[PDB]
Design a protein around this ligand. Structure first.
Ligand code: CLA
Ligand code: CLA
Ligand code: CLA
Ligand code: CLA
Ligand code: CLA
Ligand code: CLA
Ligand code: CLA
Ligand code: CLA
Ligand SMILES: CC(=O)O[C@H]1CC(C)(C)C(=C=C/C(C)=C/C=C/C(C)=C/C=C/C=C(C)/C=C/C=C(\C)C(=O)C[C@@]23O[C@]2(C)C[C@@H](O)CC3(C)C)[C@](C)(O)C1
Ligand SMILES: CC1=C(C#C/C(C)=C/C=C/C(C)=C/C=C/C=C(C)/C=C/C=C(C)/C=C/[C@@]23O[C@]2(C)C[C@@H](O)CC3(C)C)C(C)(C)C[C@H](O)C1
Lengths: 91, 63, 156, 92, 188, 166, 167
């Protein structure tokens, strides 16, 4: 990326971001964003609880699937901010 | 703005920037800074007077 | 909405019984509605007190107890919870119809007219009898509970 | 060893002395500010700054006892914090 | 911005004396010794009276549900149970400490969803812009408000008074549960 | 004016007779809060689920079994067939089929909420009965009445079977 | 338009009869949601992998082997080949092609090249000469891609379930 090849993403004069900030997901609807964010939050919190709260983590018990699903919790935050942005942009 | 009026200085480099001063004299033609604003807050040099243009002053109270 | 244009005055003398002048201090339609509901509840309550003390049956029931101390034991058993649920549903319907109306405009609801008229037994004299019997039921049930809770029981 | 963590068992170590000092320092600053507000309107504020008008200075010092209500009143009326659009500022 | 005087919060209890002039539970003027409603004039950082009323109604509603829960739970009333869950606990402070997480995990996260889905334009309320949002008007059962202005104001005033009273009650029991001896004569 | 089902209670704002089976019955006013198309799709779905559920319950209780279901080793009272079938793992097949159809259901409800003009519950699965619009309206009102009956019918059936514990 | 295979709704915007195998089947708007060139390349890649997977699974289960093989059923053949080693060599060999595919996808989606998804210009005998041949073979390829996806899913699930013979 250079100075020239960069989208006009400033939105200080407006009430919501342009959808272009979402990049590859600039067209996925707010419904999909919200549903995926909710599923991601539920699955990730389930994974974290099953990994460290319901069970005690250890060298012989660390689970790759739970570890990977934990990363869906921040993805859930991003998806919910995205859902709000697309709802405000009208998609 | 008007002689005997209280005017807020808007010159960025002034010691009295965003502060009030009493206008004592406005000159005719000539001077690029016709207004003569008199203050009571001496600057670092010690002077309490300076010449300003009409655009560098904003009236707050009239005579 | 005034006490004067209502059924339930003194029968023979015809005057309104409001010595303390409480009709003007609150929505008169609310007064009529709550009077009718209190009278009906106390009619049912004194009838049920008399029946349960008599030992009149209760279809499908298990336990036998005197009505004075029946409340705690049926609460423990769990029938009064179901009675509470049914009463709550009915009184939530009455909530929905009446509350949006206190200190307001009773659109047409005639205080006390729940439309529960399948047999077509409505009449003005019967409304007067309803009110009088309800009030006397209130006083009589007061006497019943106060006397039963102090020993004295049976026919009292 | 004085325990300054906010537990009320050890309030007397810091919390009560802290409130006492805060009240006293507020009294001091309010007396100073109110006397300055008086002096700025005097015909010779520069000379009043050196030569204190003691009869009214005593009055301001006495009246600063109720500073928390007086400062709140000036805050609400908007006569405490001058708008910054009216304070000298150096060229950024 | 809409001033405090147009809000349904006046209480006759404060203006209850010779010359008070209050009627129908409402004083002629609102109560604000520390003029926190009018603090927005000093700066926009503060919330407007719209936000303050929203927060007041939220606190009142939560406190009323809270004190009702405290009373009923301490009275011994409890729900049915299974081998997984037991709702039998009189201490209202540790009652949630002793029920399965789905239980309190469904209380939370649904309170969390509703508080957040109903909240739209609350920052406009902070900036005192009630263009399409009445404070406290989540839309839950708004049909039961009387169409008459007088009756509607009376009902909202009753709500506000009960909320304030329950906030005082719930915090009294809280502040005598912790720091014992705050509220004298408290049952809990 | 006043509700057809509740002449003492005012008509809800949204309920106006556009949706078949409307008699203005909504004391709680949840219609005014939720979109209404979602609600009527939910009503159709609940109705269809309970309509099929009553038939499945009665045929399984009577003695009818599916091809090979005799080895599912249920108590044959349906009452346990749920536990037996999830233990045997065949209800996961039902879950997969229902999710396969519910992907399309989500797409369809999203379409009609977006503006596709699909009526709620429409899926073009008609058995050649969309020939006449009046007949289609009559059948839709039949389906909604049967739904309203079948929800409570299944409720009563399962509750009575549970009280029997047979 | 009003979609085929869902005759009670309309196909999402990308589906307009532009590409092969466009039966108007995308109820969730999941290709109007994200660029359909990536979707088509993913579909094609899945299909090719599953074609090769099914035919290799069937061949190994029937008895087709290499000059040095563990000579094991195709289910455990993964573990046997990994423990032997050459599976990792296959990983490197396909990783080279996949890095070149990273490049190709980037140019195709950016617009530096007019590349169709899943088009590496592998045409030794010019079997797609005229456009009619092009769409006919693309249609056949996509139909086989989907069918082989299903075929390998069924084969591998059934084999992991019962552990029986070829079928
Ligand atoms: C809390 C206030 C806040 C509000 C916003 C608002 C915004 N941010 Mg964000 N942002 C924030 C904090 C915030 N940001 C912070 C603290 C950071 C620093 C980390 C960022 C970094 C950031 C970046 C880098 C970008 C944004 C962008 C945006 C815009 C789109 C948001 C969206 O829909 O994402 C949608 C998000 C998703 C659909 C999911 C992806 C998000 C998760 C968290 C990624 C996790 C990756 C994973 C863990 C990787 C492995 C970890 C490690 C081992 C390496 C929007 C204006 C985007 C934009 O284009 O702006 C112009 C953008 O590019 N933000
Ligand atoms: C008005 C309110 C009222 C209240 C509070 C009660 C309360 C009670 N009644 Mg009922 N009862 C009522 C009306 C009422 N009754 C009426 C109108 C009648 C006359 C038909 C009766 C006749 C009656 C009998 C004959 C008996 C009860 C009994 C009971 C118990 C619960 C019944 C139950 O679960 O029913 C289902 C809900 C409880 C003490 C039983 C009891 O206490 O037995 C020891 C019992 O035997 N009631
Ligand atoms: C009239 C009293 C007065 C008041 C109301 C304030 C107020 C303030 N000063 Mg202080 N200041 C004062 C006098 C006063 N100053 C004097 C005389 C000096 C010169 C030594 C300073 C030097 C000074 C500095 C260098 C700084 C402040 C700062 C501040 C701020 C923080 C408070 C603090 O930490 O004070 C600190 C207090 C002192 C350093 C000593 C104060 C001196 C005495 C004890 C008080 C004067 C009382 C006066 C004699 C009263 C006469 C009234 C009577 C006739 C009725 C605040 C705006 C700080 C700031 O900008 O924060 C944002 C900061 O950096 N002040
Ligand atoms: C935290 C909840 C809360 C939020 C509000 C908000 C409001 N109240 Mg208040 N109120 C509360 C609790 C609260 N109240 C309680 C418990 C009572 C005692 C019964 C009252 C009694 C009351 C009356 C009688 C009136 C109001 C009114 C108001 C309005 C103007 C005052 C203001 O700016 O408040 C801002 C509030 C706060 C910043 C919270 C207080 C925080 C400080 C630090 C105290 C800490 C607690 C304690 C001292 C320990 C505003 C909508 C007036 C109104 O609505 O007029 C139209 C009005 O007439 N309130
Ligand atoms: C359409 C034909 C068909 C075929 C070929 C099979 C085949 C089978 N079913 Mg059956 N089944 C069918 C329809 C069919 N099912 C239907 C429509 C249903 C839905 C109700 C079921 C529900 C069902 C259950 C619940 C169970 C079977 C079971 C079985 C297996 C043993 C029974 C058997 O061989 O019966 C002779 C043919 C076998 C794989 C059992 C099984 O797999 O046990 C391990 C089993 O528990 N089936
Ligand atoms: C109470 C019975 C009943 C009735 C009156 C209808 C009526 C209708 N359904 Mg059907 N439907 C039913 C039960 C019923 N359904 C059940 C239980 C399900 C779940 C599988 C469905 C699922 C369903 C879907 C998914 C769709 C329909 C559609 C239709 C319409 C065309 C077919 C028709 O006329 O069927 C009349 C049926 C009979 C006379 C025989 C029913 C009894 C059998 C033999 C048992 C019409 C409104 C379609 C529609 O909306 O078209 C525009 C549509 O998309 N229905
Ligand atoms: C992962 C494999 C895969 C991929 C990437 C695609 C990609 C595509 N297909 Mg699909 N398709 C596949 C497998 C796949 N297909 C299979 C196996 C079949 C069944 C035979 C079909 C049948 C089919 C038809 C009939 C049509 C498409 C079309 C499309 C396009 C839009 C649909 C969409 O949502 O995108 C792809 C999105 C997904 C695959 C979502 C992920 C799947 C879910 C979440 C998994 C859960 C279900 C399952 C039980 C596991 C797109 C190019 C349309 C087209 O050509 O448009 C130009 C079209 O007409 N496909
Ligand atoms: C598209 C190709 C395809 C084909 C031709 C088959 C064919 C078959 N599958 Mg299926 N299957 C498929 C796709 C396919 N499957 C897919 C996509 C999956 C993954 C969801 C499965 C998952 C699956 C399982 C889990 C099982 C079968 C089984 C079977 C066999 C018996 C089932 C039967 O008679 O059911 C009634 C008609 C049958 C030969 C069964 C088996 O093991 O048979 C020996 C069996 O248990 N299949
Ligand atoms: C859902 C839907 O669609 O529609 C619904 C939604 C909608 C609109 C919200 C509806 C509503 C209204 C609802 C739900 C209202 C609920 C109201 C509720 C729950 C109100 C409690 C008050 C409690 C107080 C004031 C307690 C004081 C307590 C005090 C002052 C005490 O002294 C307590 C005490 O402990 C101390 C401090 C000392 C101890 O010694 C013991 C005692 C006991 C003395 C409708 C109409 O239902 C329709
Ligand atoms: C007022 C009011 C309401 C209310 C109310 C409340 C709280 C209502 C409560 C009602 C309740 C609790 C009603 C119980 C009845 C029990 C019966 C009929 C038992 C008969 C039992 C009989 C006749 C027994 C007979 C026998 O013993 C005999 C004689 C001799 C034996 O040989 C045979 C047997 C054993 C069988 C509404 C309506 C809900 C809403 C409205 O808004 C306001």
């Amino acid at each position: 990326v250079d100075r020239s090849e960069a989208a006009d993403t400033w939105w200080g004069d407006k009430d919501y971001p342009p959808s272009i900030v979402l990049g590859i997901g600039k067209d996925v609807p707010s419904s999909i964003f919200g549903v995926t964010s909710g599923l991601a939050f539920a699955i990730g919190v389930y994974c974290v609880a099953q990994s460290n709260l319901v069970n005690i983590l250890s060298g012989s018990t660390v689970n790759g699937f739970y570890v990977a699903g934990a990363l869906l919790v921040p993805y859930s935050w991003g998806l919910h901010v995205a859902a709000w942005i697309q709802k405000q942009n009208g998609k | 703005i008007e002689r005997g009026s209280k005017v807020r200085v808007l010159r960025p480099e002034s010691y009295w920037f965003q502060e009030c001063g009493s206008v004592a004299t406005i000159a005719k033609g000539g001077d690029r800074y016709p207004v003569v604003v008199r203050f009571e807050k001496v600057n670092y040099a010690g002077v309490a007077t300076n010449n300003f243009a009409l655009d560098e002053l904003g009236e707050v109270e009239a005579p | 909405g005034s006490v004067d244009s209502m059924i339930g005055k003194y029968s023979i003398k015809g005057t309104v019984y409001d010595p303390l002048d409480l009709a003007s201090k609150y929505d008169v339609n609310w007064l009529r509605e709550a009077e009718l509901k209190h009278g009906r509840v106390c009619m049912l309550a004194v009838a049920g007190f008399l029946a349960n003390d008599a030992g009149w049956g209760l279809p499908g029931l298990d336990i036998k107890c005197s009505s004075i101390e029946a409340h705690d034991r049926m609460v423990e058993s769990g029938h009064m919870w179901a009675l509470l649920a049914v009463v709550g549903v009915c009184e939530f319907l009455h909530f929905s119809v009446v509350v949006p109306k206190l200190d307001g405009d009773w659109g047409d609801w005639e205080p006390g007219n729940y439309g529960l008229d399948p047999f077509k037994l409505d009449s003005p004299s019967r409304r007067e009898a309803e009110l009088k019997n309800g009030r006397l039921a209130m006083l009589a049930f007061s006497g019943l509970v106060t006397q039963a809770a102090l020993g004295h029981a049976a026919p009292y | 060893h004085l325990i300054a963590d906010g537990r009320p068992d050890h309030a007397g170590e810091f919390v009560i002395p802290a409130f006492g000092f805060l009240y006293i320092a507020g009294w001091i600053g309010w007396a100073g500010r109110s006397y300055l507000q008086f002096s700025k309107k005097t015909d010779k504020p520069n000379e009043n700054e050196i030569i204190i008008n003691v009869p009214v200075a005593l009055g301001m010092m006495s009246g600063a006892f109720l500073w928390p209500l007086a400062a709140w009143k000036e805050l609400i009326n908007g006569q405490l914090l001058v708008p910054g659009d009216e304070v000298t500022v150096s060229p950024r | 911005r809409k001033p405090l005087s147009e809000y349904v919060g006046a209480s006759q209890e404060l203006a209850a004396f010779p010359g008070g002039g209050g009627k129908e539970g409402a004083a002629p003027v609102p109560w604000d010794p520390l003029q926190l409603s009018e603090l927005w004039k000093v700066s926009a950082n503060n919330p407007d009276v719209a936000w303050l009323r929203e927060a007041e109604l939220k606190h009142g509603r939560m406190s009323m549900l809270a004190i009702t829960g405290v009373m009923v739970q301490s009275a011994g009333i409890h729900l049915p149970g299974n081998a997984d869950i037991s709702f039998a606990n009189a201490d209202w402070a540790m009652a949630p400490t002793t029920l399965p997480p789905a239980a309190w995990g469904q209380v939370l996260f649904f309170i969390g969803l509703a508080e957040g889905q109903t909240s739209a334009g609350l920052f406009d309320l902070w900036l005192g812009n009630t263009e399409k949002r009445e404070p406290g008007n989540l839309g839950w059962g708004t049909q039961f408000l009387s169409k008459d202005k007088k009756a509607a104001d009376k009902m909202r005033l009753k709500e506000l008074k009960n909320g304030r009273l329950a906030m005082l009650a719930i915090m009294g029991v809280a502040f005598n549960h912790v720091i014992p001896g705050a509220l004298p004569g408290c049952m809990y | 004016e006043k509700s057809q089902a509740l002449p003492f209670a005012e008509r809800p704002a949204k309920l106006d007779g556009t949706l078949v089976g409307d008699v203005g019955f909504d004391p709680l006013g949840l219609s005014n809060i939720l979109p209404i198309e979602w609600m009527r799709e939910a009503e159709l779905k609940h109705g269809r689920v309970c309509m099929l559920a009553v038939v499945g319950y009665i045929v399984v209780d009577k003695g009818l079994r599916a091809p090979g279901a005799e080895k599912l080793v249920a108590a044959t009272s349906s009452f346990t067939a749920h536990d037996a079938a999830v233990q045997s793992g065949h209800m996961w097949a039902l879950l997969l089929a229902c999710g396969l159809f519910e992907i399309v259901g989500a797409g369809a409800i999203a379409s009609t909420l977006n503006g596709g003009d699909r009526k709620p519950g429409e899926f073009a699965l008609t058995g050649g009965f969309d020939r006449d619009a009046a007949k289609l309206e009559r059948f839709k009102l039949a389906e909604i009445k049967h739904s309203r009956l079948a929800m409570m019918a299944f409720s009563g059936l399962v509750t009575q079977d549970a009280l029997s514990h047979g | 338009v009003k979609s085929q295979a869902l005759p009670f709704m309309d196909a999402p915007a990308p589906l307009d009869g532009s590409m092969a195998g466009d039966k108007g089947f995308d109820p969730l708007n999941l290709s109007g949601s994200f660029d359909i060139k990536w979707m088509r390349e993913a579909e094609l890649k899945h299909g090719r992998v599953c074609m090769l997977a099914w035919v290799g699974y069937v061949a190994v289960d029937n008895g087709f082997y290499v000059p040095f093989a563990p000579h094991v059923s195709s289910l455990a053949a993964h573990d046997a080949a990994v423990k032997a080693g050459p599976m990792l060599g296959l990983l490197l060999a396909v990783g080279a092609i996949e890095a070149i595919s990273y490049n190709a996808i980037a140019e195709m989606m950016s617009g530096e090249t007019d590349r169709r998804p899943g088009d590496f210009y592998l045409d030794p005998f010019n079997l797609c000469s005229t456009p009619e041949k092009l769409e006919s073979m693309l249609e056949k390829e996509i139909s086989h891609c989907r069918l082989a996806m299903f075929a390998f899913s069924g084969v591998v699930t059934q084999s992991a379930l019962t552990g029986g013979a070829f079928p």
